[PDB]
Design a protein around this ligand. Structure first.
Ligand SMILES: CCCCCCCCCCCCCCCCCC(=O)OCCOCCOCCOCCOCCOC
Ligand SMILES: *[C@@H]1O[C@H](CO)[C@@H](O[C@@H]2O[C@H](CO)[C@@H](O)[C@H](O)[C@H]2NC(C)=O)[C@H](O)[C@H]1NC(C)=O
Length: 317
């Protein structure tokens, strides 16, 4: 695992601060905060206001979130800057107290990239609850890369990319802080997720890796969005955030919790919204930026991906 000082921010602090927002609070005077990191093609509110913003409020947290522009479609290394800055702020603002991080899809990759390359936040992050994280990218993005219709983060979230290679070689496929990874074998966006083994994109060594079908059986189907919004997902998330081990406890969930529909504590209005979670995301992707190469790795990550090819050529130290 990398050590030493944190790499410098490529973006101005003022820009990173504008991306951070808390519900009913300022990061400089927030109480019991929880940082939420959105998925690709969405903003914090787009990913969570129909699910984890109201759910985490009910658990006694002040939900905060980052909205890296544009809709998490730009360089993942930059999106990570919004998070690193957010954690530094919230930690100090809550009176120097560790806080939990809750992510969805790419947000999980962003969280792990930050923990791996920015040492200073490892002691500030209490635990990590990731839903459908793609630490190893996805094979499904492959075709889009070929047709040159992929946004910067889509290339990076491609299996075998320079980014996911750098994460692996840096030691990021093993938890850094207590981590729970809830995911589904029936994920239409992120694959492979079928083996319920280290072969899965969402698997982290030493982590509490929870594949939905391992607990609920093969006929339990929850897609990329259901992994975040479902009643079962809620029961595992609540377990993870309350747990004294920092990870969800098997004793806290089971077969009786195998409900694929949006969490019960959501209003009828929120459930409908949670059900159409993918619509805005797909729209943003379809209309967003496109390129025929993967964005270059920043200096700090280059030694870990020697030989891979990015927009400027073959990576070298
Ligand atoms: C309704 C789309 C279902 C299509 C199933 C085939 C898979 C193709 C989509 C792979 C895109 C890879 C995105 C990066 C992986 C991580 C995504 C993430 O962080 O979570 C966010 C949710 O992502 C929503 C993606 O769904 C939209 C994909 O559909 C866009 C297809 O349009 C292609 C047109 O060219 C832009
Ligand atoms: C999107 O990501 C790109 C790639 O990292 C960012 O571009 C860099 O931005 C810094 C600060 O302006 C410059 O010093 C670098 O020269 C840029 N590099 C490249 C390759 O463009 C960009 O700032 C991010 N975009 C948004 C909208 O946040």
């Amino acid at each position: 695992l990398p050590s030493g000082s944190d790499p410098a921010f490529s973006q101005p602090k003022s820009v990173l601060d504008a991306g951070l927002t808390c519900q009913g609070a300022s990061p400089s005077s927030v109480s019991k905060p929880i940082l939420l990191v959105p998925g690709t093609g969405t903003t914090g509110p787009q990913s969570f206001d129909s699910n984890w913003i109201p759910l985490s409020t009910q658990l006694g947290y002040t939900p905060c979130w980052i909205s890296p522009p544009p809709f998490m479609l730009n360089d993942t290394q930059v999106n990570t800057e919004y998070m690193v800055n957010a954690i530094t702020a919230l930690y100090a603002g809550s009176g120097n107290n560790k806080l939990p991080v809750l992510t969805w899809s790419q947000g999980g990759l962003v969280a792990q990239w930050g923990l791996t390359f920015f040492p200073s936040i490892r002691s500030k992050v209490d635990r990590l609850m990731a839903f459908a994280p793609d630490y190893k990218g996805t094979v499904l993005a492959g075709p889009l890369d070929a047709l040159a219709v992929s946004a910067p983060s889509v290339w990076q979230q491609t299996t075998g990319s320079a980014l996911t290679t750098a994460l692996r070689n840096a030691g990021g496929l093993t938890q850094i802080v207590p981590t729970t990874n809830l995911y589904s074998a029936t994920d239409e966006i992120v694959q492979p997720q079928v083996s319920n083994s280290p072969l899965d994109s969402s698997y982290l060594f030493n982590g509490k890796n929870v594949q939905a079908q391992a607990v609920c059986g093969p006929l339990f189907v929850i897609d990329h969005a259901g992994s975040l919004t479902s009643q079962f997902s809620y029961v595992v998330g609540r377990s993870a955030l309350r747990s004294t081990t920092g990870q969800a406890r098997s004793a806290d969930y089971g077969i009786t919790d195998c409900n694929p529909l949006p969490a019960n504590d959501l209003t009828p209005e929120q459930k409908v919204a949670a059900a159409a979670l993918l619509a805005p995301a797909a729209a943003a992707i379809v209309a967003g930026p496109k390129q025929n190469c993967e964005p270059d790795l920043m200096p700090y990550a280059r030694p870990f991906a020697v030989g891979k090819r990015t927009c400027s050529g073959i990576v070298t130290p």
